Design a protein around this ligand. Structure first.
Ligand SMILES: *[C@@H]1O[C@H](CO)[C@@H](O[C@@H]2O[C@H](CO)[C@@H](O[C@@H]3O[C@H](CO[C@H]4O[C@H](CO)[C@@H](O)[C@H](O[C@H]5O[C@H](CO)[C@@H](O)[C@H](O)[C@@H]5O[C@H]5O[C@H](CO)[C@@H](O)[C@H](O)[C@@H]5O)[C@@H]4O)[C@@H](O)[C@H](O[C@H]4O[C@H](CO)[C@@H](O)[C@H](O)[C@@H]4O[C@H]4O[C@H](CO)[C@@H](O)[C@H](O)[C@@H]4O)[C@@H]3O)[C@H](O)[C@H]2NC(C)=O)[C@H](O)[C@H]1NC(C)=O
Ligand SMILES: *[C@@H]1O[C@H](CO)[C@@H](O[C@@H]2O[C@H](CO)[C@@H](O[C@@H]3O[C@H](CO[C@H]4O[C@H](CO)[C@@H](O)[C@H](O)[C@@H]4O)[C@@H](O)[C@H](O[C@H]4O[C@H](CO)[C@@H](O)[C@H](O)[C@@H]4O[C@H]4O[C@H](CO)[C@@H](O)[C@H](O)[C@@H]4O)[C@@H]3O)[C@H](O)[C@H]2NC(C)=O)[C@H](O)[C@H]1NC(C)=O
Ligand SMILES: *[C@@H]1O[C@H](CO)[C@@H](O[C@@H]2O[C@H](CO)[C@@H](O[C@@H]3O[C@H](CO[C@H]4O[C@H](CO)[C@@H](O)[C@H](O)[C@@H]4O)[C@@H](O)[C@H](O[C@H]4O[C@H](CO)[C@@H](O)[C@H](O)[C@@H]4O)[C@@H]3O)[C@H](O)[C@H]2NC(C)=O)[C@H](O)[C@H]1NC(C)=O
Ligand SMILES: *[C@@H]1O[C@H](CO)[C@@H](O[C@@H]2O[C@H](CO)[C@@H](O[C@@H]3O[C@H](CO)[C@@H](O)[C@H](O[C@H]4O[C@H](CO)[C@@H](O)[C@H](O)[C@@H]4O)[C@@H]3O)[C@H](O)[C@H]2NC(C)=O)[C@H](O)[C@H]1NC(C)=O
Ligand SMILES: *[C@@H]1O[C@H](CO)[C@@H](O[C@@H]2O[C@H](CO)[C@@H](O[C@@H]3O[C@H](CO)[C@@H](O)[C@H](O)[C@@H]3O)[C@H](O)[C@H]2NC(C)=O)[C@H](O)[C@H]1NC(C)=O
Ligand SMILES: *[C@@H]1O[C@H](CO)[C@@H](O[C@@H]2O[C@H](CO)[C@@H](O[C@@H]3O[C@H](CO)[C@@H](O)[C@H](O)[C@@H]3O)[C@H](O)[C@H]2NC(C)=O)[C@H](O)[C@H]1NC(C)=O
Ligand SMILES: *[C@@H]1O[C@H](CO)[C@@H](O[C@@H]2O[C@H](CO)[C@@H](O[C@@H]3O[C@H](CO)[C@@H](O)[C@H](O)[C@@H]3O)[C@H](O)[C@H]2NC(C)=O)[C@H](O)[C@H]1NC(C)=O
Ligand SMILES: *[C@@H]1O[C@H](CO)[C@@H](O[C@@H]2O[C@H](CO)[C@@H](O[C@@H]3O[C@H](CO)[C@@H](O)[C@H](O)[C@@H]3O)[C@H](O)[C@H]2NC(C)=O)[C@H](O)[C@H]1NC(C)=O
Ligand SMILES: *[C@@H]1O[C@H](CO)[C@@H](O[C@@H]2O[C@H](CO)[C@@H](O[C@@H]3O[C@H](CO)[C@@H](O)[C@H](O)[C@@H]3O)[C@H](O)[C@H]2NC(C)=O)[C@H](O)[C@H]1NC(C)=O
Ligand SMILES: *[C@@H]1O[C@H](CO)[C@@H](O[C@@H]2O[C@H](CO)[C@@H](O[C@@H]3O[C@H](CO)[C@@H](O)[C@H](O)[C@@H]3O)[C@H](O)[C@H]2NC(C)=O)[C@H](O)[C@H]1NC(C)=O
Ligand SMILES: *[C@@H]1O[C@H](CO)[C@@H](O[C@@H]2O[C@H](CO)[C@@H](O)[C@H](O)[C@H]2NC(C)=O)[C@H](O)[C@H]1NC(C)=O
Ligand SMILES: *[C@@H]1O[C@H](CO)[C@@H](O[C@@H]2O[C@H](CO)[C@@H](O)[C@H](O)[C@H]2NC(C)=O)[C@H](O)[C@H]1NC(C)=O
Ligand SMILES: *[C@@H]1O[C@H](CO)[C@@H](O[C@@H]2O[C@H](CO)[C@@H](O)[C@H](O)[C@H]2NC(C)=O)[C@H](O)[C@H]1NC(C)=O
Ligand SMILES: *[C@@H]1O[C@H](CO)[C@@H](O)[C@H](O)[C@H]1NC(C)=O
Ligand SMILES: *[C@@H]1O[C@H](CO)[C@@H](O)[C@H](O)[C@H]1NC(C)=O
Ligand SMILES: *[C@@H]1O[C@H](CO)[C@@H](O)[C@H](O)[C@H]1NC(C)=O
Lengths: 103, 113, 132, 113, 128, 452, 132, 76, 113
């Protein structure tokens, strides 16, 4: 099977800064899909095929990476963008990176 | 119809074997090459059109077999690369006409590896 | 046996051979480019598309200096930043598929230069015969 | 690739009987000419291989009329009218249209005792 | 647009069987696959199975075989050839299956694969 | 001579990828048995009797069968032509009527239906009169709408359906694809060609090989087989939604039949319209089946298990299961045989397990008379019954598989049959081809001038 | 801004400019002349009508002395009753629309004279190369 | 027909001249009788076997003329 | 004719706020290039008018980065990030595709007190 390790588990930031979340796989040579899930709502597609944004997604969500290292960078954070982020490759999902307010 | 002789070849050695054409002109006739294996029988290797200067090969033998020809002296050279012990066969020069049959044939230059 | 030379006089046989050897058998690609109730409409539309493509290429070749010539010569010089490779390697080593993907950015510039060259050649010819 | 097989593989046939060997083509062998470019080969041992007949019907000059060949595009065969001692050797079927040129296996006609 | 309406929340007993109706509307339902996925609280996501509604060829996860069945219902009237219904019947309920079940559809792009999930369902809450 | 003057060249061999329509070319031997017997004996050009491929040299073209457009044009053309071969036939609107059905005369055991003897009113040549008439329908074509019972046909809820004229045969004839002017068709020839990537030995050709169009779901029949060894093909093997095509080396043989000796009977629905009904079952009631050789099938599964262990690791437990479920003609094995559509249960082949180190299999078959292939809105057809016992023999060229897996790292890899899209059956015969567009106007430097 | 010169290199932009300035941008009207189930038949019929018109004009231009030339020169003199206007006003003042409606009666005479000129030029060329 | 005429030396010419000589076995008749007596229908059915040979010779002639012209302008 | 209007007509904006003025196009402004040829003009009083930015996105060299422009073919607008005293002047919207070239009205940004 495919095991996806997703880190950092909890990322505490303030708005305006840049977030970086990296997903490690077991096999290489495939794509990576990045989902946004706010609290108490429906999940949302952000990134498919490791670098392409979904429809209705602003350009501040950038994703890249290759092989095993898969990077998701969110520069210029918003008050709304604080949520949970998942990496899904095929049917094997990640566990979740929570994005928290720092004070 | 003039050829080379038999050889004693190490594995991993590049050897060029010639049969030079005499009498008949290079602008008319086109050579080929052959293998006489005791298991696969006869196999085709390649060809030369010496006017144009480049033809194709059998797809097993590309890379190893390179065919050059000197049209002035009319000397037709093979070249093999990284030979194995499997190439103990008899190699036949041959001559073709356009939409034509095999006119002449060589005796054979065995490569005993 | 048919013979391997019948490959080179065949259609598109020189596609892997060098650029200096495809010019002899260059007319076969020129010749086999043209000749070759809903199904009737599909086949009719494909055939008129093929002859429109051939006629577009003949018109684009005729407004240069060679209306009915397979090989041609012009009067515009090569900017060295186009391909910066000497004569012997682009006529004895390379194939046309590799050559097409090395000058693929610069082609419209070349066509504009050829159009300017034929235009100034026509006005110079008119000025030369005007005095007689 | 348009490799062929040869049915049978060895026929010891007495001096004066009819021998018939077939070669079966996977793909059809038809050129723009229309004539099926297949050649029939004989090779006496330790020599250069000759040519038995041409396409199906024409015959190589310098060969007697004890050889005949038949076929209709898909599967081909021969008929030898009378057997000699020179008819000992290895026979082949050869293709002339598609690349690489394929061969048959090779048959060895023998004696009966 | 593309809409994926589900059925409401449901309360079931252990040993029972639940049926969830993912109604899809807005595209040609006879073309694109439907997937089913479930959010277990404090355990993550887990895939369930896919269904191709042209015939109804389905596949399921390995650790859910013998427990889940999926069917579909096409639309047969030529005046509304677009809408369609997917059905998931999940049997052998335990208290471990208290979760939130989603139906999804593929990305609509010709470059995206099969598992990038653009459109989502509203969310069926299942409490055993 | 440090200056170089640019020269144009018209008729240079160089291509770029494009997509266009392709006209089909059926062989003229089918014209010798004329008069609309099979489709495209009139709507299709005869071929060149001299096909001539031209083997290229030192050339590399990237092939990709999954993003091919020619298979999509074939899937459109077969549907459009198949609809164009039903418009002159009789529409079966007036037969959609209340049926009064009973069991067929048989020692009924109280565990099977499978035949129904249905009497109903039907119009005649004249408009005024009417006639009581009986027929035999299968159980998959009647539905109990709610004494003897009272049924109706299943297509009556949505759409009346044209029956197929028995002058029109269903059997495939080989369809060639001759490229039009300006374009060309390449062909891979590499025996180890995976399906995606460079084929380092290509050959242009003006018209493709013989493609006989079969229609089959679980395992494709009469499909050009590979030469060196059994091969598998995919797009991403670690993906689940994509099928895993398999092409054999040795054709395993299947024999299929229908033992019931029917009797075709003509009913005149209307003037100039005749309806063909199953009149009587003389002989004996015996279920339709298929047979394959058990030894060759075990050997052929041994070959495909030997091939599948490369992509998955040498220590795995490959096992085969039956279909997961769905509609009828994706679980069962669908095909046509003499103009009558079988549906054959294939659980008897797909149960095994495989660890790292004479007889014949029977398998039952069910028959529908109405069919709905390609799943349109309001078009089915009524395949008329055929006189006498029929049987047909076919080589099995390959089969279509499907992997599954959710989680929990087990060493097994269960494979199941597929089906679904009809296009996969074409992607096993157009894999080696690609269409290209000639751009014959290239430009290059050499030393020359033009004389003023 | 695009620029007003892009009007003149545009299609038919020189239609109001003088006759001495339309000859530079004369190739755009030549180029945009060719390229550009009942509806399929209408569009197909219109497209083959356009290419038949272009091929008729190329054949009528090829039987004169200029098969592939936009500008040409001939060997027949102007009868003075045709237009009786000097050179400077018909190449710096007038437009082509006005010129076409001043010689509209005399055009078939001109085409017959050109056909006679090319015929006698061909027989004179054959007589010149016959002696060698 | 225009493409087959253009790959010879006359792309837009009704009358033309070439550079290949007549083999005498083709028609073996002198100039005055094949330009003052015969009609074209009779001439077409007297050389109907030899036409593809003539077209191949014309193609070879134009090919060697093109390479000779390229060799002549190459030295400048 | 493709005359335009300017909404609003005069905005006294304090030194350090965002000002935004829109111009609405009757016909679409699309060239064969694809880029909408519209220019933004500023003219300080008693001078020659400058150029603020190019098409929508490119910028005239010798102009600071306190200017940005947006639009999607039909209706266009600006955003000025910070206000100076030189930003006093008259602004215009200009078209570049169709003849005659049209203008906007002209806006005069003022001071607040
Ligand atoms: C995978 O590929 C395989 C290989 O092709 C497929 O198997 C084939 O399936 C076909 C079904 O579509 C099937 O065709 C049917 O055959 C029926 C059997 O009769 C034929 O065969 C016998 C014995 O083989 C033969 O003797 C007959 O005629 C021979 O002689 C005549 C001379 O007059 C020839 O004209 C004829 O071509 C044939 O020639 C034989 O000899 C020559 C040498 O001289 C050889 O060169 C030939 O190759 C051949 O061996 C029969 O031809 C037959 O009953 C069927 O015909 C009925 O149906 C068709 C419609 O499909 C219709 O056009 C016919 O006219 C006829 O209908 C009429 O009769 C019916 C009964 O009375 C009646 O109900 C109707 O209303 C009509 O009145 C049809 O020809 C074919 O046999 C098999 N192949 C084999 C080897 O068995 C397989 O199907 C493929 N897989 C899939 C999934 O499709
Ligand atoms: C599907 O379902 C339909 C009904 O929905 C069914 O059709 C009916 O089949 C039955 C047979 O199972 C038919 O009944 C027989 O009909 C024949 C023919 O009738 C003609 O002759 C009578 C003579 O008076 C005329 O009046 C009439 O108008 C017809 O012209 C009769 O001959 C049969 O009688 C024999 O069987 C009786 C059974 O009890 C005997 O009692 C009687 O003595 C007769 O036997 C004699 O004749 C036999 C035949 O020669 C012979 O074998 C005996 O030894 C003896 O000499 C019987 O009435 C009925 O008519 C059919 N109905 C219709 C409308 O056609 C299908 O058969 C059914 N099919 C399947 C596959 O299930
Ligand atoms: C059908 O068959 C074709 C082959 O004809 C397959 O296509 C290729 O398959 C190979 C392996 O099967 C793939 O190769 C892998 O590529 C990785 C990426 O590196 C390449 O690309 C970069 C640029 O992106 C180049 O700079 C680089 O040099 C490579 O060319 C490699 O990282 C992989 O390395 C593997 O081996 C090393 C050591 O051997 C290990 O350390 C690695 O972890 C890894 O295992 C590998 O070389 C190649 O990408 C495929 N190409 C394409 C176009 O698909 C198909 O996959 C196959 N398809 C099916 C359905 O069967
Ligand atoms: C026509 O069809 C009928 C269908 O009912 C058929 O009747 C059955 O025939 C069989 C065999 O002739 C009878 O015998 C059965 O089969 C074996 C014989 O050893 C037994 O094992 C069976 O016992 C089981 O079934 C019994 C009844 O269900 C149970 O009581 C018992 O405990 C076992 O479970 C059984 O004896 C069978 O009895 C009849 N059925 C009836 C209802 O009589 C008939 O033979 C067919 N005739 C023709 C001519 O085809
Ligand atoms: C024809 O002209 C275009 C325009 O310049 C050329 O495209 C350029 O190609 C180079 C590669 O040789 C690109 O560089 C690459 O950029 C990416 C960007 O992230 C970088 O990651 C790579 O490492 C590499 O440096 C360049 O960006 C690209 N230009 C543009 C504007 O995208 C093209 O190569 C030319 N054709 C040929 C045959 O040279
Ligand atoms: C694949 O194989 C499995 C078993 O190997 C098949 O499952 C079987 O399905 C049938 C019905 O589809 C079950 O039959 C039973 O019939 C009786 C009488 O109608 C009814 O009372 C039962 O409720 C049940 O329906 C059978 O028990 C079942 N077997 C098992 C072990 O569950 C499956 O059908 C096969 N797939 C295909 C496509 O054939
Ligand atoms: C798929 O293949 C398996 C074989 O691996 C099939 O299992 C076989 O099932 C039959 C009966 O269904 C067994 O026959 C009898 O079984 C009893 C036990 O109840 C036994 O005591 C008898 O002696 C008799 O053999 C058969 O033994 C069994 N095979 C093995 C190796 O044990 C299975 O039925 C197949 N699936 C389908 C749907 O056919
Ligand atoms: C399915 O594929 C098999 C290949 O395993 C085909 O079997 C072979 O087919 C060829 C020609 O179709 C048969 O050759 C025949 O030889 C006899 C010898 O006298 C000759 O009279 C015939 O004209 C033909 O050349 C070959 O015998 C046959 N092999 C076997 C074992 O039967 C088969 O035809 C394919 N189709 C079907 C429907 O099975
Ligand atoms: C091309 O040639 C024709 C043929 O001569 C010219 O047509 C002629 O045009 C003049 C006008 O300039 C006509 O004169 C008018 O006649 C009417 C008759 O009632 C009279 O009422 C007017 O006052 C005026 O005199 C003349 O009749 C007419 N010829 C014929 C036979 O109808 C034509 O003008 C020439 N084209 C150009 C551009 O000059
Ligand atoms: C073009 O070449 C062909 C090929 O040679 C010429 O055909 C030949 O025509 C002559 C007639 O002049 C044939 O001779 C006749 O043969 C029959 C055979 O029985 C005989 O009975 C007659 O008395 C007469 O001798 C000759 O056979 C024929 N060649 C072949 C191979 O059939 C053809 O005439 C040439 N065209 C022209 C216009 O000359
Ligand atoms: C026709 O076949 C059906 C199906 O077998 C019969 O209907 C029932 O069959 C079950 C056995 O599965 C019996 O237990 C019932 O008693 C049958 N119902 C009745 C009303 O008999 C049916 O009997 C058969 N015959 C007819 C004339 O319909
Ligand atoms: C068309 O008729 C079929 C046959 O009755 C209907 O299918 C059945 O529908 C009922 C209730 O919707 C289900 O309980 C059955 O299981 C269905 N049977 C089958 C074989 O599908 C169908 O609903 C009808 N459709 C329309 C649009 O009227
Ligand atoms: C499928 O049917 C064919 C034809 O009946 C079978 O082929 C014959 O099989 C018998 C033995 O059953 C042999 O004696 C014949 O020599 C075979 N003839 C040919 C032409 O092959 C075939 O065996 C059947 N296949 C299976 C798996 O039963
Ligand atoms: C110039 O041409 C010669 C062959 O004539 C070749 O060896 C050399 O590499 C070329 N120079 C360059 C810079 O390519
Ligand atoms: C002749 O040309 C001159 C200009 O070169 C012009 O002024 C004069 O009017 C012309 N004569 C006539 C009769 O048009
Ligand atoms: C040669 O030409 C003359 C006329 O110039 C003619 O009389 C004579 O018959 C010709 N000779 C032959 C052999 O045809």
């Amino acid at each position: 099977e495919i095991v996806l390790t997703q880190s950092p588990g909890i990322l505490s930031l303030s708005p305006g800064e840049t977030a970086t979340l990296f997903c490690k796989a077991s096999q290489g040579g495939n794509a990576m899909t990045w989902y946004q899930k706010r609290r108490g709502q429906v999940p949302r597609l952000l990134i498919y095929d490791t670098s392409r944004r979904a429809s209705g997604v602003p350009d501040r969500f950038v994703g890249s990476g290759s092989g095993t290292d898969f990077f998701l960078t969110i520069n210029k954070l918003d008050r709304e963008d604080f949520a949970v982020y998942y990496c899904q490759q095929f049917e094997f999902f990640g566990l979740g990176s929570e994005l928290e307010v720092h004070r | 119809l003039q050829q080379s002789g038999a050889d004693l070849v190490r594995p991993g050695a590049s050897v060029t074997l010639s049969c030079k054409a005499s009498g008949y002109t290079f602008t008319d006739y086109e050579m080929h090459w052959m293998k006489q294996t005791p298991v696969h029988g006869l196999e085709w290797i390649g060809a030369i059109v010496p006017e144009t200067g480049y033809t194709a090969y059998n797809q097993k033998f590309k890379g190893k077999a390179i065919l050059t020809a000197d049209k002035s002296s009319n000397t037709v050279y093979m070249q093999f690369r990284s030979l194995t012990s499997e190439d103990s066969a008899v190699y036949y020069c041959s001559r073709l006409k356009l939409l034509g049959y095999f006119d002449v044939w060589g005796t054979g230059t065995t490569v005993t590896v | 046996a048919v013979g391997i030379g019948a490959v080179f006089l065949g259609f598109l046989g020189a596609a892997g051979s060098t650029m200096g050897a495809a010019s002899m058998t260059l007319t076969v690609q020129a010749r086999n480019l043209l000749s070759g109730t809903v199904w009737g409409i599909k086949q009719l539309q494909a055939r008129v598309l093929a002859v429109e493509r051939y006629l577009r290429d003949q018109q684009l070749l005729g407004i240069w200096g060679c209306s009915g010539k397979l090989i041609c010569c012009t009067n515009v010089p090569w900017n060295s930043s186009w391909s910066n490779r000497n004569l012997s390697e682009i006529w004895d080593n390379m194939t046309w598929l590799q050559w097409d993907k090395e000058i693929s950015n610069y082609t419209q510039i070349i066509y504009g230069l050829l159009e300017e060259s034929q235009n100034q050649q026509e006005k110079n010819e008119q000025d030369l015969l005007a005095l007689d | 690739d348009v490799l062929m097989t040869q049915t049978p593989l060895s026929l010891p046939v007495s001096l004066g009987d009819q021998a018939s060997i077939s070669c079966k083509s996977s793909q059809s062998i038809v050129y723009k000419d229309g004539n099926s470019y297949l050649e029939w080969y004989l090779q006496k041992v330790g020599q250069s291989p000759k040519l038995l007949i041409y396409r199906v019907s024409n015959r190589f000059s310098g060969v007697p009329d004890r050889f005949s060949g038949s076929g209709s595009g898909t599967d081909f065969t021969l008929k030898i009218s009378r057997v000699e001692a020179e008819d000992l050797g290895v026979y082949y079927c050869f293709q002339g249209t598609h690349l690489p040129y394929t061969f048959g296996g090779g048959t060895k006609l023998e004696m009966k005792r | 647009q593309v809409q994926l309406v589900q059925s409401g929340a449901v309360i079931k007993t252990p040993g029972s069987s639940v049926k969830i109706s993912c109604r899809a509307s807005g595209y040609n339902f006879r073309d694109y696959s439907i997937h089913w996925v479930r959010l277990i609280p404090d355990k993550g996501f887990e895939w369930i199975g896919w269904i191709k509604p042209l015939w109804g060829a389905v596949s399921y996860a390995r650790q859910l075989q013998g427990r889940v069945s999926m069917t579909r219902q096409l639309s047969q009237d030529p005046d509304d050839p677009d809408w369609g219904v997917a059905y998931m019947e999940f049997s052998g309920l335990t208290p471990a299956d208290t979760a939130e079940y989603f139906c999804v559809r593929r990305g609509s792009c010709d470059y995206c694969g099969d598992f990038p999930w653009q459109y989502w369902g509203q969310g069926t809450v299942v409490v055993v | 001579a440090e200056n170089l003057w640019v020269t144009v060249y018209y008729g240079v061999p160089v291509w770029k990828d494009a997509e266009t329509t392709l006209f089909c070319a059926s062989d003229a031997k089918a014209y010798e048995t004329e008069k609309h017997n099979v489709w495209a004996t009139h709507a299709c050009v005869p071929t060149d009797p001299n096909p001539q491929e031209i083997h290229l040299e030192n050339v590399t073209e990237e092939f990709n069968m999954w993003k091919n457009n020619m298979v999509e044009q074939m899937h459109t053309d077969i549907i459009s032509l198949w609809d164009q071969s039903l418009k002159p036939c009789v529409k079966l609107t007036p037969l959609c009527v209340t049926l009064q059905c009973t069991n067929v005369t048989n020692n009924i055991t109280d565990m099977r239906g499978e035949l129904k003897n249905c009497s109903f009113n039907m119009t005649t040549e004249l408009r005024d009169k009417k006639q009581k008439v009986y027929s035999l329908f299968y159980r998959l074509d009647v539905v109990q709408i709610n004494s003897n019972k009272e049924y109706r046909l299943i297509n009556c809820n949505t759409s009346a359906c044209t029956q197929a004229c028995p002058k029109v045969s269903f059997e495939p004839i080989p369809i060639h694809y001759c490229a039009p002017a300006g374009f060309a068709i390449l062909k891979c020839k590499d025996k180890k060609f995976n399906g995606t990537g460079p084929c380092p030995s290509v050959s242009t050709v003006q018209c493709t090989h013989g493609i006989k169009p079969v229609v089959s779901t679980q395992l494709l029949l009469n499909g050009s087989l590979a030469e060196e060894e059994v091969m598998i093909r995919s797009e991403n093997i670690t993906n689940n939604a994509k099928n895993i095509l398999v092409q054999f080396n040795t054709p395993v043989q299947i024999n299929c039949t229908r033992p019931n000796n029917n009797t075709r009977k003509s009913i005149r629905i209307g003037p100039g319209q005749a309806f063909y009904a199953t009149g009587d079952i003389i002989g004996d009631i015996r279920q339709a089946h298929c047979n394959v050789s058990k030894a060759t099938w075990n050997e052929t599964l041994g070959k495909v298990v030997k091939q599948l262990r490369k992509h998955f690791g040498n220590n795995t437990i490959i096992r085969f299961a039956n279909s997961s479920g769905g509609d009828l003609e994706v679980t069962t094995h669908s095909f046509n045989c003499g103009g009558e559509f079988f549906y054959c249960n294939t659980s008897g082949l797909f149960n095994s397990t495989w660890i790292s180190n004479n007889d014949s299999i029977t398998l039952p078959c069910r028959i529908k008379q109405i069919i709905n292939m390609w799943q349109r809105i309001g078009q089915c057809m009524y395949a008329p019954p055929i006189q006498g016992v029929i049987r047909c023999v076919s080589n099995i060229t390959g089969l279509i598989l499907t992997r599954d897996g959710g989680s929990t790292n087990s060493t097994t890899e269960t494979f199941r049959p597929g089906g679904g899209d009809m296009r996969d059956n074409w992607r096993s015969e157009l894999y080696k081809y690609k269409v290209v567009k000639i751009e014959p106007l290239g430009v290059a430097p050499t030393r020359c001038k033009r004389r003023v």
